[PDB]
Write a protein that binds this ligand. Structure first.
Ligand SMILES: C[C@@]1(c2cccc(NC(=O)c3ccc(Br)cn3)c2)CO[C@@](C)(C(F)(F)F)C(N)=N1
Length: 377
Protein backbone atom coordinates (compact mmCIF):
# COMPACT_ATOMS: atom_id res chain seq x y z
CA UNK A 1 0.00 0.00 0.00
CA UNK A 2 3.01 2.27 0.52
CA UNK A 3 3.46 2.43 -3.26
CA UNK A 4 -0.13 3.69 -3.56
CA UNK A 5 0.01 6.44 -0.94
CA UNK A 6 -0.28 9.96 -2.41
CA UNK A 7 -1.34 8.69 -5.83
CA UNK A 8 -4.07 11.35 -6.08
CA UNK A 9 -3.75 14.98 -7.17
CA UNK A 10 -6.10 17.89 -7.69
CA UNK A 11 -6.69 21.62 -7.85
CA UNK A 12 -9.04 22.80 -5.11
CA UNK A 13 -12.60 22.38 -6.33
CA UNK A 14 -11.57 20.83 -9.65
CA UNK A 15 -11.58 17.18 -8.59
CA UNK A 16 -9.21 14.45 -7.43
CA UNK A 17 -7.53 12.44 -10.18
CA UNK A 18 -5.27 9.41 -10.45
CA UNK A 19 -2.83 8.52 -13.22
CA UNK A 20 -3.96 5.67 -15.46
CA UNK A 21 -2.84 4.16 -18.74
CA UNK A 22 -4.99 2.88 -21.59
CA UNK A 23 -3.98 0.88 -24.65
CA UNK A 24 -0.83 -0.87 -25.83
CA UNK A 25 1.64 0.73 -25.82
CA UNK A 26 0.26 2.49 -22.72
CA UNK A 27 -1.09 6.02 -23.09
CA UNK A 28 -0.95 7.97 -19.83
CA UNK A 29 -3.99 9.99 -18.78
CA UNK A 30 -5.14 11.75 -15.61
CA UNK A 31 -8.53 10.43 -14.52
CA UNK A 32 -11.11 11.84 -12.10
CA UNK A 33 -11.94 9.44 -9.25
CA UNK A 34 -15.74 9.37 -9.08
CA UNK A 35 -17.73 7.20 -6.66
CA UNK A 36 -20.89 8.85 -7.99
CA UNK A 37 -20.91 7.26 -11.46
CA UNK A 38 -20.10 3.93 -13.10
CA UNK A 39 -18.59 4.56 -16.55
CA UNK A 40 -14.88 4.66 -17.38
CA UNK A 41 -14.96 7.48 -19.93
CA UNK A 42 -11.99 9.24 -21.50
CA UNK A 43 -11.53 12.03 -24.02
CA UNK A 44 -10.67 10.40 -27.33
CA UNK A 45 -10.55 13.38 -29.68
CA UNK A 46 -8.91 16.83 -29.61
CA UNK A 47 -10.58 19.44 -27.43
CA UNK A 48 -9.45 23.00 -26.59
CA UNK A 49 -9.41 22.16 -22.88
CA UNK A 50 -7.79 18.73 -23.31
CA UNK A 51 -4.00 18.62 -23.05
CA UNK A 52 -4.00 15.03 -24.27
CA UNK A 53 -6.45 12.29 -25.24
CA UNK A 54 -6.87 8.57 -25.93
CA UNK A 55 -5.77 7.78 -29.50
CA UNK A 56 -7.37 4.43 -30.30
CA UNK A 57 -5.64 4.11 -33.68
CA UNK A 58 -2.33 3.86 -31.80
CA UNK A 59 -3.50 0.96 -29.62
CA UNK A 60 -3.40 -2.46 -31.28
CA UNK A 61 -5.21 -3.95 -28.29
CA UNK A 62 -8.35 -1.83 -28.76
CA UNK A 63 -11.57 -3.64 -29.63
CA UNK A 64 -14.55 -1.76 -31.04
CA UNK A 65 -17.86 -2.81 -29.44
CA UNK A 66 -19.83 -1.07 -32.21
CA UNK A 67 -22.15 0.81 -29.88
CA UNK A 68 -22.48 4.53 -29.28
CA UNK A 69 -23.23 6.17 -25.95
CA UNK A 70 -24.84 9.51 -25.12
CA UNK A 71 -24.41 10.86 -21.59
CA UNK A 72 -26.25 14.04 -20.52
CA UNK A 73 -25.59 15.66 -17.14
CA UNK A 74 -27.37 18.52 -15.35
CA UNK A 75 -24.66 20.74 -16.83
CA UNK A 76 -22.80 19.57 -19.92
CA UNK A 77 -22.94 16.38 -21.98
CA UNK A 78 -20.88 14.14 -24.25
CA UNK A 79 -21.22 11.47 -26.90
CA UNK A 80 -18.86 8.61 -27.68
CA UNK A 81 -18.17 5.03 -28.72
CA UNK A 82 -17.83 1.91 -26.59
CA UNK A 83 -14.86 -0.43 -26.82
CA UNK A 84 -12.50 -2.38 -24.57
CA UNK A 85 -8.73 -2.13 -24.11
CA UNK A 86 -5.97 -2.75 -21.59
CA UNK A 87 -6.02 -0.46 -18.55
CA UNK A 88 -3.58 -0.05 -15.67
CA UNK A 89 -3.00 2.24 -12.70
CA UNK A 90 0.77 2.91 -12.48
CA UNK A 91 0.63 3.86 -8.80
CA UNK A 92 -2.11 1.39 -8.00
CA UNK A 93 -2.10 -2.44 -7.99
CA UNK A 94 0.59 -4.13 -10.08
CA UNK A 95 -1.86 -5.42 -12.67
CA UNK A 96 -3.18 -4.64 -16.14
CA UNK A 97 -6.75 -5.60 -17.06
CA UNK A 98 -9.11 -5.41 -20.02
CA UNK A 99 -11.96 -2.99 -19.35
CA UNK A 100 -14.82 -1.19 -21.05
CA UNK A 101 -13.91 2.32 -22.20
CA UNK A 102 -16.26 5.01 -23.47
CA UNK A 103 -14.22 6.98 -25.99
CA UNK A 104 -15.52 10.56 -25.84
CA UNK A 105 -15.53 11.98 -29.37
CA UNK A 106 -17.81 14.99 -28.96
CA UNK A 107 -18.71 17.05 -25.88
CA UNK A 108 -20.26 20.27 -24.60
CA UNK A 109 -19.32 22.05 -21.38
CA UNK A 110 -17.82 18.81 -20.07
CA UNK A 111 -14.04 19.22 -20.12
CA UNK A 112 -13.10 21.94 -17.65
CA UNK A 113 -10.40 24.43 -18.65
CA UNK A 114 -7.46 23.75 -16.35
CA UNK A 115 -8.79 20.77 -14.37
CA UNK A 116 -5.91 18.55 -15.47
CA UNK A 117 -8.07 15.45 -15.91
CA UNK A 118 -8.93 13.90 -19.27
CA UNK A 119 -11.48 11.30 -18.21
CA UNK A 120 -13.57 9.91 -15.36
CA UNK A 121 -13.21 6.66 -13.42
CA UNK A 122 -16.73 5.69 -12.34
CA UNK A 123 -16.40 3.54 -9.23
CA UNK A 124 -20.10 2.94 -8.46
CA UNK A 125 -22.18 -0.05 -9.55
CA UNK A 126 -23.42 -1.31 -12.92
CA UNK A 127 -27.01 -0.34 -12.14
CA UNK A 128 -26.33 3.30 -13.04
CA UNK A 129 -23.93 2.70 -15.93
CA UNK A 130 -24.70 4.05 -19.41
CA UNK A 131 -26.10 3.06 -21.78
CA UNK A 132 -27.36 0.37 -19.41
CA UNK A 133 -26.39 -2.00 -16.61
CA UNK A 134 -24.93 -4.61 -18.96
CA UNK A 135 -21.79 -2.48 -19.30
CA UNK A 136 -19.42 -3.84 -16.67
CA UNK A 137 -17.75 -1.04 -14.62
CA UNK A 138 -13.97 -0.89 -14.27
CA UNK A 139 -13.74 -2.04 -10.68
CA UNK A 140 -15.91 -5.07 -11.41
CA UNK A 141 -13.58 -6.05 -14.25
CA UNK A 142 -10.56 -5.44 -12.01
CA UNK A 143 -11.90 -7.78 -9.32
CA UNK A 144 -13.01 -10.47 -11.78
CA UNK A 145 -9.71 -10.61 -13.65
CA UNK A 146 -7.28 -10.32 -10.74
CA UNK A 147 -6.81 -11.46 -7.17
CA UNK A 148 -7.51 -7.98 -5.79
CA UNK A 149 -9.97 -7.92 -2.85
CA UNK A 150 -13.33 -6.27 -3.57
CA UNK A 151 -12.77 -2.95 -1.80
CA UNK A 152 -10.98 0.35 -2.17
CA UNK A 153 -10.43 3.32 0.11
CA UNK A 154 -10.13 7.05 -0.48
CA UNK A 155 -8.15 9.56 1.55
CA UNK A 156 -8.92 12.94 0.01
CA UNK A 157 -6.89 15.83 1.37
CA UNK A 158 -7.55 19.56 1.29
CA UNK A 159 -4.90 22.22 0.75
CA UNK A 160 -3.24 22.34 -4.90
CA UNK A 161 -4.56 19.18 -3.24
CA UNK A 162 -3.78 15.47 -3.00
CA UNK A 163 -4.62 12.15 -1.38
CA UNK A 164 -4.54 8.38 -1.78
CA UNK A 165 -6.70 5.77 -3.45
CA UNK A 166 -5.86 2.41 -1.94
CA UNK A 167 -7.16 -0.54 -3.95
CA UNK A 168 -7.60 -3.98 -2.45
CA UNK A 169 -7.17 -3.18 1.21
CA UNK A 170 -7.07 -0.83 4.18
CA UNK A 171 -3.86 1.08 4.92
CA UNK A 172 -3.67 1.69 8.67
CA UNK A 173 -1.02 4.35 8.17
CA UNK A 174 -3.68 6.62 6.67
CA UNK A 175 -5.94 6.88 9.72
CA UNK A 176 -6.06 7.05 13.51
CA UNK A 177 -8.70 5.94 15.97
CA UNK A 178 -11.60 3.63 15.17
CA UNK A 179 -13.04 2.85 11.75
CA UNK A 180 -16.85 3.02 11.85
CA UNK A 181 -19.07 1.34 9.26
CA UNK A 182 -22.44 2.27 7.79
CA UNK A 183 -24.32 -0.20 5.55
CA UNK A 184 -24.54 0.30 1.81
CA UNK A 185 -28.33 0.26 1.54
CA UNK A 186 -28.52 -0.50 -2.17
CA UNK A 187 -25.79 -1.16 -4.75
CA UNK A 188 -26.21 1.46 -7.42
CA UNK A 189 -24.83 4.69 -6.08
CA UNK A 190 -23.04 4.15 -2.79
CA UNK A 191 -26.30 4.75 -0.94
CA UNK A 192 -26.29 5.17 2.83
CA UNK A 193 -28.62 6.38 5.59
CA UNK A 194 -28.37 9.50 7.75
CA UNK A 195 -30.29 9.06 11.01
CA UNK A 196 -29.63 12.39 12.71
CA UNK A 197 -28.18 15.83 11.95
CA UNK A 198 -26.87 18.36 14.46
CA UNK A 199 -25.50 21.86 13.96
CA UNK A 200 -23.32 23.04 16.82
CA UNK A 201 -24.68 20.24 18.97
CA UNK A 202 -28.32 21.13 18.30
CA UNK A 203 -30.55 18.48 16.73
CA UNK A 204 -32.38 19.70 13.61
CA UNK A 205 -35.26 17.60 14.95
CA UNK A 206 -36.69 16.34 11.68
CA UNK A 207 -38.23 12.98 10.89
CA UNK A 208 -35.06 11.20 9.83
CA UNK A 209 -36.56 10.13 6.51
CA UNK A 210 -36.23 13.79 5.54
CA UNK A 211 -32.43 13.47 5.64
CA UNK A 212 -32.57 10.73 3.01
CA UNK A 213 -35.21 12.08 0.64
CA UNK A 214 -35.07 10.44 -1.75
CA UNK A 215 -31.65 8.85 -1.26
CA UNK A 216 -28.34 9.73 0.39
CA UNK A 217 -25.04 8.91 -1.31
CA UNK A 218 -21.28 9.27 -0.90
CA UNK A 219 -19.89 10.94 -4.04
CA UNK A 220 -16.25 11.93 -4.60
CA UNK A 221 -17.37 13.39 -7.92
CA UNK A 222 -19.48 16.05 -6.22
CA UNK A 223 -17.82 18.98 -4.45
CA UNK A 224 -20.52 20.11 -2.03
CA UNK A 225 -22.58 18.69 0.74
CA UNK A 226 -25.94 18.72 -1.04
CA UNK A 227 -29.14 18.60 1.00
CA UNK A 228 -32.89 18.27 0.33
CA UNK A 229 -34.64 21.65 0.40
CA UNK A 230 -36.17 21.19 3.86
CA UNK A 231 -32.89 20.09 5.42
CA UNK A 232 -30.92 22.74 3.54
CA UNK A 233 -33.07 25.62 4.74
CA UNK A 234 -32.91 24.39 8.34
CA UNK A 235 -29.12 24.09 8.09
CA UNK A 236 -28.75 27.59 6.67
CA UNK A 237 -30.96 28.96 9.45
CA UNK A 238 -28.77 27.34 12.12
CA UNK A 239 -25.49 28.38 10.50
CA UNK A 240 -26.74 31.95 10.04
CA UNK A 241 -27.81 32.08 13.70
CA UNK A 242 -24.36 30.93 14.85
CA UNK A 243 -22.50 33.39 12.62
CA UNK A 244 -24.83 36.34 13.13
CA UNK A 245 -22.09 38.78 14.20
CA UNK A 246 -21.37 39.06 10.48
CA UNK A 247 -24.02 39.26 7.77
CA UNK A 248 -23.32 38.12 4.21
CA UNK A 249 -25.32 38.78 1.02
CA UNK A 250 -28.01 36.28 0.00
CA UNK A 251 -25.78 35.20 -2.86
CA UNK A 252 -23.20 33.76 -0.49
CA UNK A 253 -25.69 31.32 1.03
CA UNK A 254 -26.73 30.31 -2.50
CA UNK A 255 -23.14 29.69 -3.58
CA UNK A 256 -23.26 32.46 -6.19
CA UNK A 257 -20.89 34.76 -4.32
CA UNK A 258 -17.56 34.72 -2.48
CA UNK A 259 -16.88 35.96 1.03
CA UNK A 260 -13.34 37.17 1.72
CA UNK A 261 -11.23 38.10 4.72
CA UNK A 262 -7.74 39.60 4.86
CA UNK A 263 -5.32 36.67 4.55
CA UNK A 264 -5.13 34.70 7.78
CA UNK A 265 -8.07 36.36 9.53
CA UNK A 266 -10.93 34.01 8.63
CA UNK A 267 -13.23 33.96 11.71
CA UNK A 268 -13.55 30.17 11.80
CA UNK A 269 -15.01 30.28 15.30
CA UNK A 270 -18.28 32.01 14.36
CA UNK A 271 -19.18 29.11 12.07
CA UNK A 272 -20.70 25.97 13.69
CA UNK A 273 -19.69 22.33 13.35
CA UNK A 274 -22.03 20.01 11.45
CA UNK A 275 -22.57 16.46 12.69
CA UNK A 276 -23.98 13.80 10.37
CA UNK A 277 -25.04 10.62 12.18
CA UNK A 278 -24.90 7.59 9.89
CA UNK A 279 -26.78 4.33 10.39
CA UNK A 280 -24.64 1.77 12.21
CA UNK A 281 -24.31 -1.95 11.49
CA UNK A 282 -26.31 -2.71 14.66
CA UNK A 283 -29.97 -1.73 15.03
CA UNK A 284 -30.46 1.83 16.31
CA UNK A 285 -26.75 2.32 16.84
CA UNK A 286 -25.15 5.15 14.88
CA UNK A 287 -21.90 7.05 14.64
CA UNK A 288 -21.29 10.67 13.72
CA UNK A 289 -18.78 12.38 11.50
CA UNK A 290 -18.22 16.02 12.37
CA UNK A 291 -17.61 18.67 9.72
CA UNK A 292 -15.76 21.92 10.51
CA UNK A 293 -16.16 25.20 8.58
CA UNK A 294 -12.67 24.61 7.22
CA UNK A 295 -14.45 21.90 5.22
CA UNK A 296 -17.76 23.47 4.17
CA UNK A 297 -16.27 26.86 3.40
CA UNK A 298 -14.34 26.03 0.24
CA UNK A 299 -11.36 28.29 -0.52
CA UNK A 300 -11.28 29.70 -4.04
CA UNK A 301 -7.67 30.19 -5.15
CA UNK A 302 -7.11 33.25 -7.33
CA UNK A 303 -3.86 35.18 -7.57
CA UNK A 304 -5.84 38.40 -8.06
CA UNK A 305 -7.64 38.02 -4.72
CA UNK A 306 -4.64 36.58 -2.89
CA UNK A 307 -4.22 39.46 -0.45
CA UNK A 308 -7.33 37.80 1.02
CA UNK A 309 -8.60 34.33 1.72
CA UNK A 310 -11.91 33.92 -0.15
CA UNK A 311 -14.47 31.12 0.12
CA UNK A 312 -17.62 29.68 -1.41
CA UNK A 313 -20.35 28.17 0.76
CA UNK A 314 -20.03 24.49 -0.17
CA UNK A 315 -23.45 23.40 1.05
CA UNK A 316 -26.27 23.53 -1.49
CA UNK A 317 -29.82 22.43 -2.19
CA UNK A 318 -30.57 19.17 -4.01
CA UNK A 319 -33.78 17.84 -5.54
CA UNK A 320 -32.31 14.34 -5.95
CA UNK A 321 -31.41 13.58 -2.35
CA UNK A 322 -28.43 14.08 -0.06
CA UNK A 323 -24.93 14.00 -1.52
CA UNK A 324 -21.95 13.70 0.78
CA UNK A 325 -19.39 15.13 -1.60
CA UNK A 326 -15.67 15.84 -1.38
CA UNK A 327 -15.95 18.50 1.31
CA UNK A 328 -17.49 15.80 3.49
CA UNK A 329 -14.97 13.10 2.55
CA UNK A 330 -11.93 15.38 2.92
CA UNK A 331 -9.99 14.73 6.10
CA UNK A 332 -11.56 11.29 6.52
CA UNK A 333 -10.30 7.89 5.45
CA UNK A 334 -13.27 6.40 3.65
CA UNK A 335 -13.41 2.67 3.01
CA UNK A 336 -15.66 1.40 0.24
CA UNK A 337 -16.01 -2.19 1.43
CA UNK A 338 -17.95 -3.65 -1.48
CA UNK A 339 -17.29 -7.21 -0.29
CA UNK A 340 -19.15 -6.60 2.97
CA UNK A 341 -21.58 -3.99 1.58
CA UNK A 342 -20.52 -1.22 3.96
CA UNK A 343 -18.65 2.08 3.99
CA UNK A 344 -16.19 2.89 6.75
CA UNK A 345 -15.16 6.29 8.11
CA UNK A 346 -12.08 7.10 10.18
CA UNK A 347 -10.14 10.25 11.01
CA UNK A 348 -7.50 10.77 8.34
CA UNK A 349 -3.88 11.84 8.69
CA UNK A 350 -4.92 15.00 6.82
CA UNK A 351 -8.09 15.78 8.77
CA UNK A 352 -8.92 19.43 9.46
CA UNK A 353 -8.57 21.02 12.89
CA UNK A 354 -7.58 24.20 14.67
CA UNK A 355 -6.59 25.00 18.25
CA UNK A 356 -10.18 24.60 19.52
CA UNK A 357 -11.96 22.08 17.28
CA UNK A 358 -11.26 19.00 15.16
CA UNK A 359 -13.02 16.84 12.59
CA UNK A 360 -14.02 13.59 14.27
CA UNK A 361 -15.63 10.17 13.88
CA UNK A 362 -17.38 9.11 17.08
CA UNK A 363 -19.63 6.26 18.20
CA UNK A 364 -21.68 4.42 19.11
CA UNK A 365 -24.76 6.55 19.75
CA UNK A 366 -28.04 4.86 20.69
CA UNK A 367 -31.51 6.05 19.73
CA UNK A 368 -34.82 4.90 21.22
CA UNK A 369 -37.01 5.87 18.25
CA UNK A 370 -37.06 2.79 16.03
CA UNK A 371 -38.25 4.44 12.81
CA UNK A 372 -36.52 3.22 9.65
CA UNK A 373 -34.86 6.32 8.21
CA UNK A 374 -34.83 5.02 4.66
CA UNK A 375 -37.11 7.02 2.36
CA UNK A 376 -37.99 4.23 -0.10
CA UNK A 377 -37.65 0.46 0.12
C1 LIG B 1 -20.02 11.79 -13.98
C2 LIG B 1 -20.30 13.01 -13.03
C3 LIG B 1 -19.34 14.20 -13.32
C4 LIG B 1 -19.20 14.79 -14.61
C5 LIG B 1 -18.32 15.88 -14.83
C6 LIG B 1 -17.57 16.40 -13.76
C7 LIG B 1 -17.69 15.84 -12.46
N1 LIG B 1 -16.99 16.28 -11.29
C8 LIG B 1 -16.17 17.35 -11.14
O1 LIG B 1 -15.85 18.14 -12.02
C9 LIG B 1 -15.62 17.58 -9.75
C10 LIG B 1 -15.11 18.83 -9.34
C11 LIG B 1 -14.61 18.95 -8.02
C12 LIG B 1 -14.62 17.84 -7.15
BR1 LIG B 1 -13.95 18.00 -5.44
C13 LIG B 1 -15.15 16.61 -7.60
N2 LIG B 1 -15.63 16.52 -8.88
C14 LIG B 1 -18.57 14.75 -12.27
C15 LIG B 1 -21.76 13.52 -13.27
O2 LIG B 1 -22.06 14.40 -12.16
C16 LIG B 1 -21.99 13.84 -10.82
C17 LIG B 1 -21.73 15.06 -9.88
C18 LIG B 1 -23.39 13.21 -10.49
F1 LIG B 1 -23.51 12.96 -9.16
F2 LIG B 1 -24.39 14.05 -10.88
F3 LIG B 1 -23.57 12.02 -11.13
C19 LIG B 1 -20.85 12.81 -10.68
N3 LIG B 1 -20.66 12.29 -9.50
N4 LIG B 1 -20.09 12.45 -11.68
Amino acid sequence: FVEMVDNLRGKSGQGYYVEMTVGSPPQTLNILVDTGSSNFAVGAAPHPFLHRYYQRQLSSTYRDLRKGVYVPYTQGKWEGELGTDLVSIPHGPNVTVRANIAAITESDKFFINGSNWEGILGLAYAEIARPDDSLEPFFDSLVKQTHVPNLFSLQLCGASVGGSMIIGGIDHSLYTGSLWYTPIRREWYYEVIIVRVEINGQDLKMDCKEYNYDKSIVDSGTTNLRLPKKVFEAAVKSIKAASSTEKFPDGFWLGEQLVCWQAGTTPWNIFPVISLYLMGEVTNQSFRITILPQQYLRPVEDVATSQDDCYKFAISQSSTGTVMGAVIMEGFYVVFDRARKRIGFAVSACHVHDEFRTAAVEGPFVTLDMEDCGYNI
